[PDB]
RNA sequence: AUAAUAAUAAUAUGGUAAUAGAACAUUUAAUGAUAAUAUAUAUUAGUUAUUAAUUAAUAUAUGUAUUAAUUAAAUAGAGAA
RNA sequence: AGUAUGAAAAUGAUUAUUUUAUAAGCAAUCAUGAAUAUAUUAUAUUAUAUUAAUGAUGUACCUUUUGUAUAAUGGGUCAGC
């Protein structure tokens, strides 16, 4: 309904942010960050359903919480407009949730330690196979096209300074 | 208090010291005056429509 | 009193100055003077003429002003006189550039292929290059609004000194271009300005010193580096070379191994020379034999085409491109 | 068959016609502000006029602002040097201005030993080759 | 001195010396002298005098400062400037005093405008 | 030999075999004032230089023709032929008439699998290239061949495709000069 | 007869303990314009022979500088316990 | 142990760029390819920036000492004091 052409100019960051995503967040999980990492590294770039399945059949305690989070993120994506079979976990990390209560451990022979009690949160960003993954495939293709080939007897720069004199 | 005439070499010049506030006030008055002019014209047009 | 009335009369005065480009006002403009001094323009070229050269055509304000919602607002420039813009000048400058540059290229490389020559010409005087040159010179665009100028209360001299066309305010704000025509592009305006200056120079000097314009061009445009060897891209050069040899009084070209090392390795070196009789035409190194052969043919073709004769020689008119 | 590769020329400023690198200088000062005294004195005292007379290809803007006194140059390449001349005397300001006018606009940069000449041109003699050398290796 | 091949050749290089510092150049080349020129201002032209060698692809007229008459070699002074500012620190091995040796040497950008056999 | 200049290597004061990269030695080496002949230690592939262009490509009124600088160092008798066609070794033949050509064309359309280019060449004592120039095959056959080629390409791994791309890029680069 | 900067010549310009000289950052007091087109602060990219300041871009605040500058006071500067 | 605010650091996870599975040390500097990033005069054969190809040289700091890489001394690290 218009004869006006346009050209859009967007930063790399702007491109990244505007692709359809969904941002899951856990509640105050009772665990170490290290323990969370030990699981979360497995769920790196998986499809959300696959990740959920892995969490279900994992032996770890954080696993259930992670599964629940993934389920919530899927539900959010559905509400927005996205599909659950389209969603893959783009990023998933953990962090300290703060207010870890220290508590002295009394040892033998008038010695002591301090026992902290770590609480964490897992956040994750689900992105779409339909867009983000396609975009990065396209980028990879462009990079491949750009890539200058290996030339056998090719023009390499004569590195070093000339010194105001012909050496040949 | 330098001026462009003070230097007597035509590639030299002194930009006009008009305070930002004064400029803003001028802008406000002009755009306001335009708005007033427009509103009166619209009212007149409405009156003419009402008449016939 | 009213501030609107004061603004309106200022605008009217500015419009009148644009229409005239009165000489005294142009002289007063510091930017114009500095431009004149920078380029070492002739004293016969008046400051009014220089101001005019910076004035692009802008008779009527376009329909796209009606909506800044569609991503455009033209609020900087003021309407120009129909018979005092850079438009006629610009065309003349373009013609001069197309003549002189091309002639210089032909003098340099009398056998240069037609497509290659055209590319070289473009390189020397493309719109982007011309715009860059104008920027380098210091031809700045009138980006500031008329209202803003009035508020600052700056003279019309400064306006005259700047480049003047329908430059779209909010051109790429929020990363949104509108893709308008050539009559609203900055690069194009800058190109026109540099062509207009050349045309003005020509106009003033033609009767006294006819070649003044052409030496100015040589100084500014033809002084720029262009390796003509980087312009070429052959397809089946051996065949083309053979055709060339047939056309001239030369024996059939055959490629022969001069030197060889590292056969049966990742990166050998094969030197082959395309001989016509005992004379070698092209020398070609390569990782493969085929590659070396190809390179020898390409070298031969380069030597044929990019042959540059001396000024002392009588004119070399080539016998056309080698139609394979 | 032969085809062109679209390519653009490189401007060497010096060779045909020298365009002077410094195009515009802005003298900035404050009426209040004790750091702008030497700048103010310079502006007053017939030196600026002489300068402008000497260099009519540079335009010399003179601005008033609340902050420290400033010398911003503007070059042909599009870069902009800005020297703050806070608390400098007249002569120091003038020296700074001279330095600015001297500059080709390009960014400051570490040079290695003997990194002297910067050519666009292909070597007049070729690049060396072991097959084509005068003395063959063994 | 039969200087005919040099005169003929389209490509041509020079090895002129400023203060016994050699600089190998063609026309268009952009020499960067590592000092502040006092004599020449920006825009001034320098006629090179101590030219050691003048060379084609296969010939060269080399020797004591070759007769200037034989050639031309005009440089243009295209900007006095400086190197990037550096501050190396100078200190001994059990001494808290660390003297900063600030450095920002001067440069003079020349451009070889003309180079030809006269 | 027009010019009788003394000839010089690009001389170092140091041992050239051990210190060829040492610019200092080159800088040190002074030689007596005058004209010299320093033959270039380079191939003349990319050079548009006037001392590199051959005499046949120079114009008739060029002074440079007479001067001895496009040196014929190599000899065509000594060098052996590389990727040379059989026409170049034993001369081109223009023997086949119109009728023979028409017959060839008829054959090729009829059955390009049986009557392939090489077979035609063998029959008529002529080149496969010439056969191709003479006669188109049935477009169906061409389409089939294209489909086969596409299938082969698909059968590749990722690596092979990349290598082929690189090869193509190299080929393109060869013809630049 | 002074100063500021620039010239030409010469001489000097490593450094612990230590002596002397001269500067800068920070905070308060006296005097004190300016203004969210500003200021303050941060990152980055610049410029100034560069502990520093300044330009620009950007984020955040704040309708605003005890602000520039001259003094005078310092709880005036931390990889060393 | 006020109330805001808080891109202060140390520190955790993740990603992106880039490097890294034949190479041996204060981990840097300098040299130097290469890859990438950004760039409203990249005209470009451009610039800068990020980065452990690669080569050269390189025995933390401090105190205390006739003398320290020292296997003499102090410091886990950052912020405040």
């Amino acid at each position: 309904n218009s004869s006006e052409r346009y050209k859009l100019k967007l930063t790399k960051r702007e491109i990244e942010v505007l692709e359809p995503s969904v941002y899951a967040q856990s509640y105050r999980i009772k665990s170490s960050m290290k323990k969370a990492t030990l699981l979360l590294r497995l769920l790196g770039g998986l499809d959300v359903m696959k990740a959920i399945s892995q969490c279900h059949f994992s032996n770890k305690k954080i696993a259930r919480e992670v599964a629940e989070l993934l389920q919530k993120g899927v539900k959010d994506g559905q509400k927005l407009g996205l599909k659950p079979e389209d969603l893959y976990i783009s990023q998933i990390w953990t962090g300290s949730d703060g207010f870890w209560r220290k508590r002295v451990e009394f040892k033998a022979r008038t010695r002591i330690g301090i026992i902290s009690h770590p609480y964490i949160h897992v956040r994750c960003i689900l992105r779409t196979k339909s867009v983000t993954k396609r975009r990065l495939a396209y980028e990879a293709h462009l990079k491949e096209q750009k890539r200058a080939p290996w030339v056998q007897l090719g023009d390499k720069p004569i590195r070093g300074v000339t010194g105001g004199v012909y050496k040949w | 208090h330098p001026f462009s005439d003070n230097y007597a070499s035509p590639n030299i010049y002194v930009v006009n010291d008009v305070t930002s506030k004064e400029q803003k006030s001028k802008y406000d008055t002009i755009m306001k005056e335009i708005q007033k002019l427009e509103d009166d014209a619209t009212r007149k047009a409405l009156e003419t429509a009402r008449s016939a | 009193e009213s501030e609107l009335a004061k603004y309106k009369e200022y605008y009217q005065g500015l419009k009148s100055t644009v229409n005239e480009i009165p000489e005294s006002v142009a002289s007063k403009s510091p930017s114009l003077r500095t431009l004149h001094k920078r380029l070492q323009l002739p004293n016969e070229l008046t400051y009014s003429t220089l101001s005019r050269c910076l004035t692009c055509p802008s008779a009527k304000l376009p329909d796209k002003i009606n909506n800044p919602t569609k991503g455009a607002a033209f609020v900087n420039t003021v309407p120009t006189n129909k018979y005092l813009d850079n438009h006629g000048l610009n065309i003349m400058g373009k013609n001069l550039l197309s003549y002189h540059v091309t002639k210089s290229i032909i003098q340099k490389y009398p056998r240069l292929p037609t497509v290659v020559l055209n590319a070289a010409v473009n390189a020397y005087i493309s719109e982007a290059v011309l715009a860059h040159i104008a920027k380098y010179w210091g031809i700045e665009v009138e980006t500031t609004s008329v209202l803003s100028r009035y508020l600052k209360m700056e003279p019309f001299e400064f306006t005259l000194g700047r480049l003047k066309f329908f430059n779209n305010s909010l051109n790429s704000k929020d990363g949104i271009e509108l893709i308008t025509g050539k009559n609203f592009s900055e690069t194009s305006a800058l190109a026109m300005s540099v062509r207009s200056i050349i045309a003005a120079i020509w106009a003033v000097t033609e009767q006294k010193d006819s070649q003044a314009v052409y030496r100015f061009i040589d100084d500014h445009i033809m002084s720029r580096k262009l390796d003509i060897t980087k312009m070429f891209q052959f397809e089946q050069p051996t065949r083309e070379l053979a055709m060339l040899c047939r056309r001239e009084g030369l024996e059939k070209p055959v490629s022969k191994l001069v030197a060889e090392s590292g056969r049966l390795s990742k990166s050998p070196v094969f030197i082959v020379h395309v001989f016509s009789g005992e004379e070698t035409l092209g020398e070609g190194y390569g990782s493969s034999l085929k590659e070396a052969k190809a390179r020898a043919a390409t070298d031969a073709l380069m030597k044929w085409y990019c042959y540059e004769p001396l000024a002392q020689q009588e004119p070399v008119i080539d016998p056309g491109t080698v139609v394979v | 068959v032969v085809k062109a590769i679209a390519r653009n020329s490189i401007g060497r400023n010096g060779v045909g016609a020298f365009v002077f690198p410094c195009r515009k200088i802005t003298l900035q000062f404050c009426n209040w502000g004790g750091s702008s005294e030497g700048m103010r004195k310079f502006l007053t005292s017939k030196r600026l006029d002489k300068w402008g007379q000497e260099f009519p290809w540079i335009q010399f803007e003179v601005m008033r602002k609340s902050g420290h006194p400033l010398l911003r140059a503007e070059y042909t390449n599009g870069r902009e040097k800005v020297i703050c001349v806070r608390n400098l005397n007249i002569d120091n300001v003038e020296n700074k201005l001279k330095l600015l006018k001297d500059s080709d606009g390009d960014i400051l940069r570490r040079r290695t030993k003997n990194d002297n000449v910067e050519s666009l041109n292909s070597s007049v003699r070729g690049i060396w080759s072991p097959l084509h050398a005068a003395k063959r290796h063994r | 001195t039969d200087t005919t091949p040099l005169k003929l050749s389209n490509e041509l290089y020079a090895i002129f010396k400023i203060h016994n510092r050699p600089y190998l150049v063609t026309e268009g080349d952009r020499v960067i002298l590592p000092f502040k020129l006092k004599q020449a201002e920006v825009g001034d032209i320098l006629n090179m005098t101590d030219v050691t060698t003048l060379g084609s692809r296969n010939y060269k007229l080399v020797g004591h400062p070759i007769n200037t008459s034989l050639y031309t070699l005009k440089a243009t002074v295209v900007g006095k400037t400086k190197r990037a500012f550096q501050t190396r620190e100078v200190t001994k091995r059990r001494n808290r005093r660390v003297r900063h040796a600030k450095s920002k040497g001067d440069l003079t950008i020349l451009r070889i405008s003309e180079l030809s056999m006269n | 030999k027009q010019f009788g200049f003394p000839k010089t290597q690009v001389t170092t004061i140091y041992n050239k075999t051990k210190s060829a990269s040492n610019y200092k030695g080159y800088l040190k080496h002074r030689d007596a004032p005058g004209m010299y002949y320093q033959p270039s230690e380079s191939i003349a592939t990319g050079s548009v230089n006037s001392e590199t262009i051959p005499r046949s490509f120079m114009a008739a009124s060029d002074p440079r023709r007479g001067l001895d600088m496009p040196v014929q160092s190599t000899k065509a008798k000594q060098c052996p032929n590389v990727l040379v066609g059989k026409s170049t070794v034993n001369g081109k033949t223009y023997h086949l008439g119109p009728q023979e050509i028409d017959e060839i064309r008829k054959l090729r359309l009829d059955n390009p699998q049986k009557y392939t280019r090489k077979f035609l060449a063998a029959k008529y004592g002529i080149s496969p290239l010439f056969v191709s120039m003479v006669s188109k095959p049935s477009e169906q056959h061409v389409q089939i061949m294209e489909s086969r080629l596409q299938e082969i390409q698909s059968r590749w791994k990722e690596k092979r495709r990349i290598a082929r791309e690189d090869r193509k890029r190299r080929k393109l680069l060869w013809y630049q000069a």
Side-chain angles (χ1 to χ4, degrees), chain F residues 104-119:
Chain F
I104 289 156
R105 286 170 56 75
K106 180 181 157 60
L107 286 156
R108 219 220 156 130
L109 286 157
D110 278 28
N111 202 351
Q113 296 187 333
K114 184 178 176 180
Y115 297 109
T116 193
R117 288 165 52 254
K118 184 176 163 189
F119 183 83

PDB file of all heavy atoms in Angstrom, chain F residues 104-119:
ATOM      1  N   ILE F 104      28.758 -35.997 -40.299  1.00  0.00           N
ATOM      2  CA  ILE F 104      29.190 -35.945 -38.894  1.00  0.00           C
ATOM      3  C   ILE F 104      28.071 -35.427 -37.993  1.00  0.00           C
ATOM      4  O   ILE F 104      27.798 -35.999 -36.937  1.00  0.00           O
ATOM      5  CB  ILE F 104      30.440 -35.049 -38.729  1.00  0.00           C
ATOM      6  CG1 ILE F 104      31.668 -35.740 -39.330  1.00  0.00           C
ATOM      7  CG2 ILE F 104      30.714 -34.713 -37.263  1.00  0.00           C
ATOM      8  CD1 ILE F 104      32.771 -34.793 -39.756  1.00  0.00           C
ATOM      9  N   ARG F 105      27.456 -34.325 -38.416  1.00  0.00           N
ATOM     10  CA  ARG F 105      26.327 -33.716 -37.700  1.00  0.00           C
ATOM     11  C   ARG F 105      25.158 -34.685 -37.540  1.00  0.00           C
ATOM     12  O   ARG F 105      24.578 -34.795 -36.456  1.00  0.00           O
ATOM     13  CB  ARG F 105      25.842 -32.469 -38.437  1.00  0.00           C
ATOM     14  CG  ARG F 105      26.761 -31.271 -38.296  1.00  0.00           C
ATOM     15  CD  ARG F 105      26.367 -30.153 -39.248  1.00  0.00           C
ATOM     16  NE  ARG F 105      24.973 -29.745 -39.073  1.00  0.00           N
ATOM     17  CZ  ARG F 105      24.497 -29.009 -38.062  1.00  0.00           C
ATOM     18  NH1 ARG F 105      25.292 -28.566 -37.086  1.00  0.00           N
ATOM     19  NH2 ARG F 105      23.200 -28.710 -38.026  1.00  0.00           N
ATOM     20  N   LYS F 106      24.818 -35.358 -38.636  1.00  0.00           N
ATOM     21  CA  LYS F 106      23.771 -36.383 -38.660  1.00  0.00           C
ATOM     22  C   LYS F 106      24.063 -37.495 -37.652  1.00  0.00           C
ATOM     23  O   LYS F 106      23.194 -37.875 -36.867  1.00  0.00           O
ATOM     24  CB  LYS F 106      23.661 -36.976 -40.067  1.00  0.00           C
ATOM     25  CG  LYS F 106      22.603 -38.056 -40.242  1.00  0.00           C
ATOM     26  CD  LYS F 106      22.599 -38.596 -41.664  1.00  0.00           C
ATOM     27  CE  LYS F 106      21.990 -39.986 -41.741  1.00  0.00           C
ATOM     28  NZ  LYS F 106      20.573 -40.033 -41.282  1.00  0.00           N
ATOM     29  N   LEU F 107      25.294 -37.999 -37.696  1.00  0.00           N
ATOM     30  CA  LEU F 107      25.767 -39.044 -36.780  1.00  0.00           C
ATOM     31  C   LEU F 107      25.652 -38.654 -35.312  1.00  0.00           C
ATOM     32  O   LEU F 107      25.229 -39.464 -34.480  1.00  0.00           O
ATOM     33  CB  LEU F 107      27.232 -39.380 -37.073  1.00  0.00           C
ATOM     34  CG  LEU F 107      27.461 -40.196 -38.345  1.00  0.00           C
ATOM     35  CD1 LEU F 107      28.870 -39.990 -38.881  1.00  0.00           C
ATOM     36  CD2 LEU F 107      27.194 -41.668 -38.082  1.00  0.00           C
ATOM     37  N   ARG F 108      26.037 -37.419 -35.011  1.00  0.00           N
ATOM     38  CA  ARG F 108      26.148 -36.961 -33.628  1.00  0.00           C
ATOM     39  C   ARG F 108      24.780 -36.830 -32.966  1.00  0.00           C
ATOM     40  O   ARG F 108      24.584 -37.264 -31.831  1.00  0.00           O
ATOM     41  CB  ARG F 108      26.896 -35.624 -33.548  1.00  0.00           C
ATOM     42  CG  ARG F 108      27.831 -35.542 -32.349  1.00  0.00           C
ATOM     43  CD  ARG F 108      27.822 -34.181 -31.678  1.00  0.00           C
ATOM     44  NE  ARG F 108      28.235 -34.297 -30.277  1.00  0.00           N
ATOM     45  CZ  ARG F 108      29.162 -33.565 -29.652  1.00  0.00           C
ATOM     46  NH1 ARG F 108      29.834 -32.591 -30.269  1.00  0.00           N
ATOM     47  NH2 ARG F 108      29.406 -33.806 -28.368  1.00  0.00           N
ATOM     48  N   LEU F 109      23.848 -36.208 -33.688  1.00  0.00           N
ATOM     49  CA  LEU F 109      22.442 -36.115 -33.277  1.00  0.00           C
ATOM     50  C   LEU F 109      21.806 -37.489 -33.065  1.00  0.00           C
ATOM     51  O   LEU F 109      21.103 -37.706 -32.076  1.00  0.00           O
ATOM     52  CB  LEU F 109      21.631 -35.365 -34.339  1.00  0.00           C
ATOM     53  CG  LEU F 109      21.850 -33.853 -34.383  1.00  0.00           C
ATOM     54  CD1 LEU F 109      21.479 -33.290 -35.746  1.00  0.00           C
ATOM     55  CD2 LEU F 109      21.056 -33.166 -33.277  1.00  0.00           C
ATOM     56  N   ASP F 110      22.058 -38.388 -34.013  1.00  0.00           N
ATOM     57  CA  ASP F 110      21.513 -39.750 -33.986  1.00  0.00           C
ATOM     58  C   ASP F 110      21.898 -40.535 -32.735  1.00  0.00           C
ATOM     59  O   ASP F 110      21.029 -41.104 -32.070  1.00  0.00           O
ATOM     60  CB  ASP F 110      21.957 -40.535 -35.233  1.00  0.00           C
ATOM     61  CG  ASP F 110      21.093 -40.250 -36.453  1.00  0.00           C
ATOM     62  OD1 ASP F 110      20.521 -39.143 -36.556  1.00  0.00           O
ATOM     63  OD2 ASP F 110      20.991 -41.141 -37.321  1.00  0.00           O
ATOM     64  N   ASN F 111      23.194 -40.569 -32.425  1.00  0.00           N
ATOM     65  CA  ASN F 111      23.699 -41.398 -31.329  1.00  0.00           C
ATOM     66  C   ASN F 111      25.038 -40.873 -30.781  1.00  0.00           C
ATOM     67  O   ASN F 111      26.101 -41.342 -31.186  1.00  0.00           O
ATOM     68  CB  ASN F 111      23.817 -42.859 -31.807  1.00  0.00           C
ATOM     69  CG  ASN F 111      23.821 -43.865 -30.663  1.00  0.00           C
ATOM     70  OD1 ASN F 111      23.907 -43.507 -29.486  1.00  0.00           O
ATOM     71  ND2 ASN F 111      23.730 -45.141 -31.016  1.00  0.00           N
ATOM     72  N   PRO F 112      24.987 -39.890 -29.854  1.00  0.00           N
ATOM     73  CA  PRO F 112      26.222 -39.343 -29.277  1.00  0.00           C
ATOM     74  C   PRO F 112      26.974 -40.309 -28.346  1.00  0.00           C
ATOM     75  O   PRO F 112      28.177 -40.139 -28.143  1.00  0.00           O
ATOM     76  CB  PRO F 112      25.736 -38.113 -28.507  1.00  0.00           C
ATOM     77  CG  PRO F 112      24.331 -38.431 -28.153  1.00  0.00           C
ATOM     78  CD  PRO F 112      23.787 -39.255 -29.277  1.00  0.00           C
ATOM     79  N   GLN F 113      26.271 -41.298 -27.790  1.00  0.00           N
ATOM     80  CA  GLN F 113      26.893 -42.337 -26.964  1.00  0.00           C
ATOM     81  C   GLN F 113      27.740 -43.298 -27.808  1.00  0.00           C
ATOM     82  O   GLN F 113      28.853 -43.653 -27.415  1.00  0.00           O
ATOM     83  CB  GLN F 113      25.832 -43.115 -26.178  1.00  0.00           C
ATOM     84  CG  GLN F 113      25.067 -42.260 -25.177  1.00  0.00           C
ATOM     85  CD  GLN F 113      24.145 -43.071 -24.278  1.00  0.00           C
ATOM     86  OE1 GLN F 113      23.679 -44.148 -24.656  1.00  0.00           O
ATOM     87  NE2 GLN F 113      23.869 -42.547 -23.087  1.00  0.00           N
ATOM     88  N   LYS F 114      27.204 -43.709 -28.956  1.00  0.00           N
ATOM     89  CA  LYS F 114      27.936 -44.545 -29.913  1.00  0.00           C
ATOM     90  C   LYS F 114      28.952 -43.694 -30.674  1.00  0.00           C
ATOM     91  O   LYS F 114      30.153 -43.975 -30.643  1.00  0.00           O
ATOM     92  CB  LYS F 114      26.970 -45.222 -30.896  1.00  0.00           C
ATOM     93  CG  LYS F 114      27.628 -46.181 -31.881  1.00  0.00           C
ATOM     94  CD  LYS F 114      26.598 -46.847 -32.778  1.00  0.00           C
ATOM     95  CE  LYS F 114      27.264 -47.736 -33.818  1.00  0.00           C
ATOM     96  NZ  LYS F 114      26.271 -48.392 -34.714  1.00  0.00           N
ATOM     97  N   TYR F 115      28.455 -42.655 -31.348  1.00  0.00           N
ATOM     98  CA  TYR F 115      29.285 -41.754 -32.147  1.00  0.00           C
ATOM     99  C   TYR F 115      29.719 -40.545 -31.315  1.00  0.00           C
ATOM    100  O   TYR F 115      29.241 -39.424 -31.520  1.00  0.00           O
ATOM    101  CB  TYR F 115      28.535 -41.314 -33.411  1.00  0.00           C
ATOM    102  CG  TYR F 115      28.209 -42.451 -34.347  1.00  0.00           C
ATOM    103  CD1 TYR F 115      26.900 -42.903 -34.510  1.00  0.00           C
ATOM    104  CD2 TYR F 115      29.219 -43.082 -35.071  1.00  0.00           C
ATOM    105  CE1 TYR F 115      26.606 -43.953 -35.371  1.00  0.00           C
ATOM    106  CE2 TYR F 115      28.937 -44.133 -35.934  1.00  0.00           C
ATOM    107  CZ  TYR F 115      27.626 -44.567 -36.080  1.00  0.00           C
ATOM    108  OH  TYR F 115      27.340 -45.606 -36.935  1.00  0.00           O
ATOM    109  N   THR F 116      30.626 -40.798 -30.376  1.00  0.00           N
ATOM    110  CA  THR F 116      31.187 -39.745 -29.516  1.00  0.00           C
ATOM    111  C   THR F 116      32.252 -38.930 -30.262  1.00  0.00           C
ATOM    112  O   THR F 116      32.726 -39.341 -31.322  1.00  0.00           O
ATOM    113  CB  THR F 116      31.751 -40.319 -28.189  1.00  0.00           C
ATOM    114  OG1 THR F 116      31.999 -39.249 -27.270  1.00  0.00           O
ATOM    115  CG2 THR F 116      33.045 -41.125 -28.395  1.00  0.00           C
ATOM    116  N   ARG F 117      32.618 -37.785 -29.690  1.00  0.00           N
ATOM    117  CA  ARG F 117      33.545 -36.824 -30.319  1.00  0.00           C
ATOM    118  C   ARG F 117      34.876 -37.453 -30.733  1.00  0.00           C
ATOM    119  O   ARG F 117      35.366 -37.226 -31.841  1.00  0.00           O
ATOM    120  CB  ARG F 117      33.845 -35.666 -29.358  1.00  0.00           C
ATOM    121  CG  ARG F 117      32.692 -34.698 -29.164  1.00  0.00           C
ATOM    122  CD  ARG F 117      32.897 -33.798 -27.949  1.00  0.00           C
ATOM    123  NE  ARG F 117      34.193 -33.112 -27.933  1.00  0.00           N
ATOM    124  CZ  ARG F 117      35.238 -33.410 -27.151  1.00  0.00           C
ATOM    125  NH1 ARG F 117      35.209 -34.410 -26.268  1.00  0.00           N
ATOM    126  NH2 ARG F 117      36.348 -32.679 -27.256  1.00  0.00           N
ATOM    127  N   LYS F 118      35.448 -38.220 -29.811  1.00  0.00           N
ATOM    128  CA  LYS F 118      36.721 -38.920 -30.007  1.00  0.00           C
ATOM    129  C   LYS F 118      36.666 -39.912 -31.169  1.00  0.00           C
ATOM    130  O   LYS F 118      37.613 -40.016 -31.953  1.00  0.00           O
ATOM    131  CB  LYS F 118      37.077 -39.669 -28.725  1.00  0.00           C
ATOM    132  CG  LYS F 118      38.425 -40.368 -28.716  1.00  0.00           C
ATOM    133  CD  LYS F 118      38.681 -40.970 -27.343  1.00  0.00           C
ATOM    134  CE  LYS F 118      39.780 -42.013 -27.371  1.00  0.00           C
ATOM    135  NZ  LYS F 118      39.867 -42.734 -26.071  1.00  0.00           N
ATOM    136  N   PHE F 119      35.565 -40.652 -31.244  1.00  0.00           N
ATOM    137  CA  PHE F 119      35.315 -41.606 -32.326  1.00  0.00           C
ATOM    138  C   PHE F 119      35.236 -40.905 -33.680  1.00  0.00           C
ATOM    139  O   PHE F 119      35.826 -41.369 -34.661  1.00  0.00           O
ATOM    140  CB  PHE F 119      34.013 -42.361 -32.066  1.00  0.00           C
ATOM    141  CG  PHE F 119      33.709 -43.415 -33.088  1.00  0.00           C
ATOM    142  CD1 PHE F 119      34.276 -44.681 -32.986  1.00  0.00           C
ATOM    143  CD2 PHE F 119      32.857 -43.147 -34.158  1.00  0.00           C
ATOM    144  CE1 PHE F 119      34.001 -45.661 -33.930  1.00  0.00           C
ATOM    145  CE2 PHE F 119      32.582 -44.121 -35.106  1.00  0.00           C
ATOM    146  CZ  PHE F 119      33.153 -45.382 -34.991  1.00  0.00           C
TER     147      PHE F 119
END
